[PDB]
Amino acid sequence: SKIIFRLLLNVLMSIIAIISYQWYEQLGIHLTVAPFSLLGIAIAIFLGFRNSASYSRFVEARNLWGTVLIAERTLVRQLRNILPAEHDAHRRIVSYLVAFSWSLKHQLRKTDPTADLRRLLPEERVTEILASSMPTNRILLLAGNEIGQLREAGKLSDITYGLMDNKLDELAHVLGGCERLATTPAFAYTLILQRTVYLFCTLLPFALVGDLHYMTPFVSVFISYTFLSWDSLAEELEDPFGTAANDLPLNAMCNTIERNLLDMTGQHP
Template sequence: MIVRPRPHWLRMLFVWRGSVLSDIAPQLLWTTAFAVLVTVLHGRLFQWKVPLNFVPFSLIGLTLAIFLGFRNSTSYSRYWEARTLWGTLLNETRTLVRQALTLADAPSEATTPAMRLIAFVHALRHQLRGTDPSADLARLLPGEDSARLRAARFKPAMLLLMVGEWLRDQRQQGRLDPTLAQGMEHPLGRLTEALGGCERIAGTPIPFTYSVIIHRTIYLYCVLLPFGLVDAIGPMTPVVVAFIAYTFFALEALGAEIEEPFGTQPNDLALDAMSHTIESTVREMLGEPQAVLSPMAGRAGYIQT
């Protein structure tokens, strides 16, 4: 995810990174080149004049814009829900660590659940992205915890179980009042809900038929558009086609990108920064040195939850 100050309006016109222009450049250039060819041939295809004007494109364009708006709204809803769930991770992790430090009779042992919670956040990030969490788990957990997780398929869920086991042990040893232990189960339960919500978003994409319908309609629209404009605007046809094609191609690409908010593309969620932000705030509560963040990673991590 790109997080930076909003550039000047003039620079905004030429910004490249994060604009999805690199993703749509080939089809945009091809569409523009085809519009130039249609303009040169004045709408003729093998000596046959294609009988089109701008009227059907006005009707189809309006419908296509509404359909694209629905698709992008659905994609953004998934994106924002994912961001809200990661805000929940930050809030409930802080709550659990604070309770472990202030409610238990042995606050020095709060390091164990705190490090397991940090490992949970990093393990969730790796699970959502399909990457290997071994390095982060080995860095954060003692050998016996790492060995226990090695064979686990759903490592974030196992880490929450281990935090719950710590609560059980503290209660059984008389270091935590049963009523207080029950209260600490509430933020732990909300972490479980956030985990399930992230897994649901990652495992349930928008139905494929939406993408197919929009993709086919956009390309047919942009290929036929120069035939409907060439008689009305002549040499300006490639310019108008390029502008309209850019709008439709970019909206389609953006919707596809934010539909899966846990990836590593420029407009996806800044999971690395948010994970390190949670680690930093927990370590600070424990009185340990904070994890080092780059300025932009820190900016991305401290988004309002």
């Protein structure tokens, strides 16, 4: 958030514009507003569409995480409703579902899931999970064996197994959607558009000065602020899985998921 830096440099560029207006018609240099109107409206259009895309990715990310909570709540719901007495199963599945959420956070944050895993699962499971090119996937497989074994033992039918299998499928879709949003970056343009906006804002006073004279800085900074604010919104929407204040609060969301699942299985945080 060196937007305040970019403003100050604008005020500076404005002063340089006023000062150097003295030599403007002489060097053979004239700068009108109308060409900058054209360019500025074009950039605003492009910024409008770009931000629209950024916003949508951020919302999709928030939604995918939304689905983790919904699908996990419902899997636990089904286990209790279908197998009310299998409390061991209840607890092991819950510990996989909770491990899934934390490991999803670690995967997207590019951090180590070991501590969280060790808190939740026996060490043999941790080892098996850590060895996988995709830990969240191994957890889904392991949650799968729990309902799998219940099915082998005749406690679930093929139908009731399928109802719960569908929830693991839904979690696979969340996993896939997040990995798609993480490793998605023509982000190359987000930077190009940014430099465009920067260059435009810094050239702008030079074009305004002929008309506004001493008023240049105020108008220049006002227009710069509007474009720079809008442009920086994109930047803040473009790393939804990051650690910045305006990124998704994944730690808090994992705590909510865990709290919900412990609540449903009669445990106290």
